[PDB]
């Protein structure tokens, strides 16, 4: 009917010369095609170029640091010990900060130079063993502890203005003692009041790097001029140095662009730190309508962002009655300030800002998550390009990863951007359409890809566009 062949007729018809040659021809053709596709894969593999080697980063290259200068104002009344600080590390890990700068805890009386000792703790903070408990408890949550070792931290002149050699001997012993006890770094402040600054900084940096290479030394100055900042960083180049360099002005955005690009050009794109002060809040220098813009800028510039406590909620020392503005109180809840009761509202607190998805704490938490995981924001290359009158735009790109575009508006007027790039590297040229991660002001929702030619900005707005590696 239509059934197939049996074994006998198949064995008698599939043995003729003409079918045998067809079967051997198809077998040899299949094997040469297999070898051809293997050779094509091998040829394509050795013509894909390369990718560069990671740069083997330290722990302070991977996110922000957090300065807690006054300890008893960080908790409140009574519980201002080193013991009470142990209960805050889950809040600190909510921010994803990689290090912590504990303020000076040693015994200082006043200008008496021979009585202050940098090895022995003032009993108003605790004893020697709950410091050890704090170090281990912070090491479990992946938070490093930096110790401030400024000698005369109770007094107007911060480095004991009469003698210069014995206080350098004090710091030289204290570095060794606390490195053996187990701290992960140091900070010395007000180095413009220290004579022979560049010599002692090199020695202390040497001792700290000689113990281990995952140790840090931070120096702070009140300078704002680039030539002194550069003068302290000639022999030393592994030093993090915090200064008042960006706290001058920025009424116009091209001024801030000039400051950032002039610093990075003058030091040769070395690793730097970005802050507004050596010890002060952002609301000591900026109006409250610029805090989101400056927080987007400080997280997407190539270096280590450094903040004090209360910068993530926008704490203002002049928002309430009398108080030392060098050390305001942190507003955890609405009963955090007992005096002048009822003066603290709910959107001024840590607790009341964690639920609002358009608060300042939420922007800090989103930005500090993106800073510690994206490779083009971890060690990417910075490039700024020209834009409209009053803008600051730049791009961060590493190799073949997701690229980031940041556009910021330091102006009290509406702007259309008009990204006149035309000078970028070929590895980071701009697409026609890019995504969104966030904005500082409401009116947009994120994930929706926007076209970069009629890009319009309302005043005091910053954007976090994003785009993948292509050609």
């Amino acid at each position: 009917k239509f059934t197939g062949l049996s074994k006998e007729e198949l064995l008698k018809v599939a043995g003729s010369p003409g079918w045998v040659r067809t079967r051997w021809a198809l077998l040899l053709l299949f094997w040469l095609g297999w070898l051809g596709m293997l050779a094509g894969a091998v040829v394509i593999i050795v013509r894909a170029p390369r990718c560069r080697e990671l740069p083997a980063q330290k722990w302070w290259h991977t996110g922000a640091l957090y300065r807690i200068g006054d300890l008893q104002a960080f908790q409140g009344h009574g519980a201002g010990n080193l013991a009470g600080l142990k209960g805050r590390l889950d809040y600190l890990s909510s921010l994803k900060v990689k290090g912590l700068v504990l303020g000076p805890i040693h015994k200082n009386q006043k200008d008496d130079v021979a009585q202050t000792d940098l090895l022995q703790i003032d009993p108003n903070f605790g004893s020697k063993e709950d410091f050890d408990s704090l170090l281990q408890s912070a090491k479990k949550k992946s938070i490093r502890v930096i110790l401030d070792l400024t000698p005369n931290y109770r007094g107007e002149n911060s480095w004991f203005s009469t003698q210069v050699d014995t206080v350098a001997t004090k710091v030289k012993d204290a570095l060794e003692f606390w490195l053996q006890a187990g701290v992960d770094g140091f900070q010395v402040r007000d180095i413009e009041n220290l004579k022979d600054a560049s010599s002692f900084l090199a020695e202390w940096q040497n001792i700290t790097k000689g113990f281990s290479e995952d140790r840090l030394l931070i120096a702070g100055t009140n300078s704002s001029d680039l030539q002194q900042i550069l003068s302290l960083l000639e022999s030393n180049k592994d030093l993090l140095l915090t200064s008042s360099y960006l706290s001058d002005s920025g009424s116009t955005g091209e001024h801030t662009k000039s400051l950032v690009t002039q610093y990075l050009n003058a030091t040769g794109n070395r690793w730097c730190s970005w802050s507004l002060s050596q010890a002060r809040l952002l609301t000591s220098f900026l109006p409250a309508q610029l805090l989101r813009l400056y927080q987007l800028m400080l997280f997407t510039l190539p270096g280590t962002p450094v903040f004090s406590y209360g910068d993530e909620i926008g704490l203002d020392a002049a928002a309430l009655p009398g108080q030392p503005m060098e050390a305001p109180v942190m507003l955890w809840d609405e009963s955090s300030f007992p005096d002048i009761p009822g003066a603290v509202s709910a959107n001024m607190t840590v607790k009341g800002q964690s639920e609002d998805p358009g608060s300042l704490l939420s922007l800090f938490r989103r930005l500090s998550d993106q800073r510690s995981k994206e490779r083009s924001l971890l060690h990417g290359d910075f490039h700024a390009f020209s834009a409209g009158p009053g803008l600051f735009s730049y791009i961060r790109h590493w190799d073949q990863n997701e690229r980031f575009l940041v556009v910021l508006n330091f102006g009290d007027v509406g702007l259309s951007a008009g990204l006149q790039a035309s000078d970028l590297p070929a590895s980071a040229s701009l697409p026609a359409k890019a995504d969104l991660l966030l904005s500082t002001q409401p009116g947009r929702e994120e994930g929706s890809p926007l076209e970069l030619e009629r890009l319009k900005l309302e005043p005091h707005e910053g954007l976090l566009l994003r785009f993948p590696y292509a050609a």
Partner: protein, 464 residues
């Protein structure tokens, strides 16, 4: 006599089940249980519970394989229970979406992890992986078309390779745990998510990882003593995979903390980069060997399924032919390889696993309720081993839970999968349901001529 020549021992069956169960899931992504569990100890609990619930289904297929004793592994069982319609729907959806996509995806992951030490964080070239995947598919198709013993030898070698690599990872984790740290396992069950929607999703992710315990039921007519060697090999291969899956995650959690586990593209590569200084390419090479071991078992199971579907009246009878010497089902293997090479040409086929998330567990559960219905209707069949009715009932509830998750969430893709599975009904009512000497003659003459030419080319007759 041209028949299919039963040559599969106990060790070959153990290596088939272990080499299909252990794949790239234990290597590149044991992350779902941890991201929905948010703790180490609760993750280990979910892994053990998923292993127990997969043992409960493996026992049911041991009983079904010794009762019905025909190859096909759910196709034959649905034929024996609710025959005709539903068996054709299962055969159609596995011919159309299930097996070509899974075989192409396994081949693509093999090609991606062969070239990973040359491209460490680099975004490896696209066209070089498709060519290596096509070469891998064609080589394994040739090896299974030559002899059956060659395929069982390949399965043995690469199963030994992947088990030795996982034993190395486990031993490194155990020596670092007992040596001097033991640090992460002191304050477990902290931050745990004891919600229904999280424990359910963690159990779903852990129960997808134990998939593949039904591979030996596809080749039941090729086992030596199927009343002995099938349940013995299932009962040997289940606790091995469960112990390996628990100890590999213990070794992962000893060395790595939670943050870099949850933010890595492959956990075993991060493990190798952190604990092996040099020879950290051993683990991506081992991942490639594991995918090479899985593709062979997938090819053998799909070819035997299409063979049985051709023998049962569906899927025209050229696919039922057997080579006259070297007794291998050559045109079935050729058809399977052609479909996998066709599905390699589609970019972004990783979307396509969202379309048979509902169907696979639906047909597993349909075979379990067919086992229950045959236990009620025909209680006097010869059963060489029958278990209690506890296991089919609890696995029926487990499969109802397994199909309820892609229907509530991800509900658009499941209806697309149901439409794909129902897209073969014009073939069932217009060709298969109508008998012969009533079908159009010009179709029959064409199919007969093509069958005769393929028969002369492949040197293959139907079974005697």
């Amino acid at each position: 006599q041209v028949k299919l020549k039963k040559e599969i021992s106990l060790l070959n069956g153990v290596c088939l089940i272990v080499g299909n169960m252990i794949g790239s899931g234990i290597f590149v992504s044991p992350k779902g249980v941890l991201i929905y569990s948010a703790s180490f100890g609760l993750s280990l609990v979910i892994w053990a519970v998923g292993g127990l619930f997969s043992v409960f289904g493996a026992l049911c297929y041991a009983e079904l394989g010794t009762t019905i004793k025909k190859s096909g592994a759910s196709y034959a069982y649905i034929l024996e229970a609710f025959g005709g319609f539903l068996a054709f729907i299962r055969l159609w959806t596995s011919l159309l979406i299930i097996e070509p996509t899974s075989q192409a995806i396994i081949a693509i992951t093999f090609a991606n992890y062969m070239v990973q030490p040359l491209f460490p964080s680099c975004f490896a070239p696209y066209a070089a992986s498709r060519l290596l995947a096509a070469a891998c598919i064609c080589l394994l198709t040739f090896i299974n078309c030559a002899y059956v013993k060659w395929g069982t030898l390949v399965q043995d070698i690469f199963t030994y390779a992947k088990v030795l690599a996982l034993i190395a990872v486990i031993v490194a984790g155990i020596v670092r745990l007992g040596q001097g740290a033991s640090t992460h396992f002191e304050n477990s069950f902290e931050g745990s998510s004891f919600a229904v929607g999280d424990i359910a999703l963690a159990l779903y992710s852990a129960l997808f990882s134990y998939s593949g315990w039904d591979t030996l039921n596809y080749v039941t007519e090729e086992i030596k003593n199927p009343e002995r060697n099938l349940p013995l090999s299932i009962g040997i291969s289940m606790p091995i995979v469960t112990i390996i899956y628990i100890l590999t995650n213990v070794a992962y959690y000893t060395v790595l903390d939670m943050r870099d586990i949850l933010a890595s593209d492959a956990v075993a590569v991060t493990f190798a980069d952190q604990i092996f200084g040099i020879f950290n390419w051993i683990i991506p090479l081992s991942v490639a060997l594991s995918c090479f071991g899985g593709l062979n078992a997938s090819i053998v199971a799909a070819s035997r399924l299409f063979f049985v579907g051709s023998r049962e009246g569906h899927l025209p009878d050229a696919i039922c032919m057997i080579h006259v010497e070297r007794f291998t089902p050559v045109p079935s293997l050729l058809f399977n390889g052609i479909m996998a090479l066709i599905y390699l040409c589609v970019e972004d086929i990783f979307q396509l696993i969202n379309y048979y998330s509902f169907s696979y567990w639906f047909f597993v559960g349909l075979s379990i309720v067919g086992q229950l219905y045959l236990r009620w209707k025909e209680p006097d069949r010869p059963r060489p081993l029958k278990l209690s009715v506890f296991f089919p009932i609890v696995f029926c509830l487990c499969t109802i839970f397994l199909v309820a998750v892609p229907l509530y969430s991800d509900t658009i893709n499941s209806l697309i999968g149901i439409a794909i599975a129902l897209s073969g009904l014009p073939f069932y009512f217009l060709i298969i349901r109508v008998p012969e000497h009533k079908r159009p003659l010009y179709l029959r003459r064409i199919v007969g001529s093509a069958t005769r030419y393929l028969q002369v080319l492949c040197m293959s007759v139907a079974a005697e």
